[PDB]
Design an enzyme around this catalytic site. Structure first.
Site, mmCIF file in Angstrom:
data_model
loop_
_atom_site.group_PDB
_atom_site.id
_atom_site.type_symbol
_atom_site.label_atom_id
_atom_site.label_comp_id
_atom_site.label_asym_id
_atom_site.label_seq_id
_atom_site.Cartn_x
_atom_site.Cartn_y
_atom_site.Cartn_z
ATOM 1 C CG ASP B 34 44.224 74.945 35.682
ATOM 2 O OD1 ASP B 34 43.492 74.779 36.681
ATOM 3 O OD2 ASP B 34 44.039 74.337 34.602
ATOM 4 N N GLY B 78 36.897 71.633 31.542
ATOM 5 C CA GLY B 78 35.475 71.839 31.805
ATOM 6 C C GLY B 78 34.863 72.985 30.989
ATOM 7 C CG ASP B 227 41.027 73.460 39.309
ATOM 8 O OD1 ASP B 227 42.018 74.176 39.024
ATOM 9 O OD2 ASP B 227 40.242 72.977 38.427
#
Ligand SMILES: *[C@@H]1O[C@H](CO)[C@@H](O[C@@H]2O[C@H](CO)[C@@H](O)[C@H](O)[C@H]2NC(C)=O)[C@H](O)[C@H]1NC(C)=O
Ligand code: NA
Lengths: 6, 345
Positions: B34, B78, B227
């Site tokens: 990530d 998120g 990302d």
């Protein structure tokens, strides 16, 4: 879908 | 030195995961790689959530090198949150080791954050956004002079648009720690410089966007998190509206649908779209853009750009995920800090 920090 | 992390592509390009080894003797886990976060965590063996019962967990009691802590760990993404406590242990990946890596031992998450075959996440961004306050594994290696070249090279393999693809594809791409893989890209790498105030996320400015031949008002340009742990491309609501206004027949999904923030358009329209970074246009393939029908209306297909309004405390206004990154070879460079893109071989 996912969405990785804030 | 250099070292390679083989990626497993999970959920039809939803997440890309690599192997981490924690503890003595080593306990191995598949963790999401990530570039939009900076903490390492793994599900702990005491975790009583359902997902924990169905995947591999870290047993702190059977690592002779584990150093416990009472310090709380919690991180918000998120897609949800993950909580537990910090610990410190030896960690390896790609043939490298950090002996006293601090990381999260997670014992609760919001529903569906991860599941089998995943057990956690490895953040690849900068220390300043680490919830733990610990230096990220990658950043220790880069800082210590252990790498041939102070950068990581990323190739994410595409399965979206392959109708015979599986939910777990072990041939999912590669991250090269300490260089770039010249067999995976063609031509020169275009580096977009990151200044010393921007070392948080891995982020760069969007210069322009073109969709169906129209340049979109991306208004004051957005800083974009590049990302690897985001599936799609998240943009401000006003921007998403403008984007989909360029596709004939596009509409926002209602909210009643359960898909507020998503937009759909005629399935038989091939969308031509590119993002401009560092003076070059980078196309997004139709296989990435078109996510298929989310509703019973099979004539309409969801796009990869979705509305996500960011906290005004966020230094990023876009999150540019795998939907984009699949179309380029990507270099995350520690020094001089930069993101580079190259054409795939
Ligand atoms: C760079 O990418 C290539 C292509 O994926 C890698 O090639 C594989 O390497 C293994 C051994 O390490 C071979 O047994 C495979 O047959 C290769 N695959 C293909 C398709 O050629 C290569 O390892 C990578 N190099 C580095 C330094 O990471
Ligand atoms: Na194993």
């Amino acid at each position: 879908x996912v969405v990785x920090a804030x | 030195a250099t070292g390679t992390v083989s990626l497993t592509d999970v959920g039809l390009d939803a997440s890309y995961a690599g192997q981490v080894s924690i503890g003595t003797p080593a306990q191995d886990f598949l963790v999401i790689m990530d570039s939009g976060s900076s903490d390492l965590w793994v599900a702990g063996s005491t975790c009583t959530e359902n997902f924990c019962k169905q995947t591999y967990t870290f047993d702190t009691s059977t690592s002779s090198s584990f150093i416990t802590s009472s310090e709380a760990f919690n991180i918000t993404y998120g897609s949800g949150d993950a909580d537990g406590t910090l610990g410190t242990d030896t960690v390896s990946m790609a043939g490298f080791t950090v002996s006293d890596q601090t990381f999260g031992v997670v014992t609760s998450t919001s529903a569906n954050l991860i599941s089998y075959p995943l057990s956690g996440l490895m953040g690849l961004a900068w220390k300043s956004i680490a919830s733990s306050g610990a230096t990220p594994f990658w950043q220790t290696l880069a800082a210590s002079g252990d790498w041939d070249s102070p950068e990581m090279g990323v190739y994410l393999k595409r399965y979206r648009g392959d109708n015979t693809a599986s939910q777990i594809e072990t041939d999912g791409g590669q991250i090269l720690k300490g260089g770039l893989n010249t067999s995976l890209y063609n031509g020169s790498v275009n580096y977009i410089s990151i200044d010393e105030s921007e070392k948080d996320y891995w982020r760069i400015p969007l210069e322009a966007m073109v969709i169906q031949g129209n340049s979109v008002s991306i208004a004051s340009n957005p800083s974009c998190a590049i990302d690897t742990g985001t599936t799609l491309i998240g943009v401000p609501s006003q921007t998403a509206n403008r984007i989909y206004s360029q596709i004939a027949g596009a509409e926002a999904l209602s909210a009643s649908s359960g898909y507020e923030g998503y937009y759909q358009y005629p399935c038989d329209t091939e969308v031509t779209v590119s993002l401009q970074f560092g003076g070059m246009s980078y196309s997004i393939s139709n296989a990435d853009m078109n996510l298929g029908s989310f509703t019973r209306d099979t004539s309409m297909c969801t796009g990869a750009f979705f509305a996500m309004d960011m906290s005004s405390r966020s230094p990023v206004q876009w999150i540019v995920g795998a939907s984009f990154i699949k179309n380029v070879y990507t270099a995350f460079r520690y020094n001089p800090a930069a993101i580079g893109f190259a054409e795939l071989v």
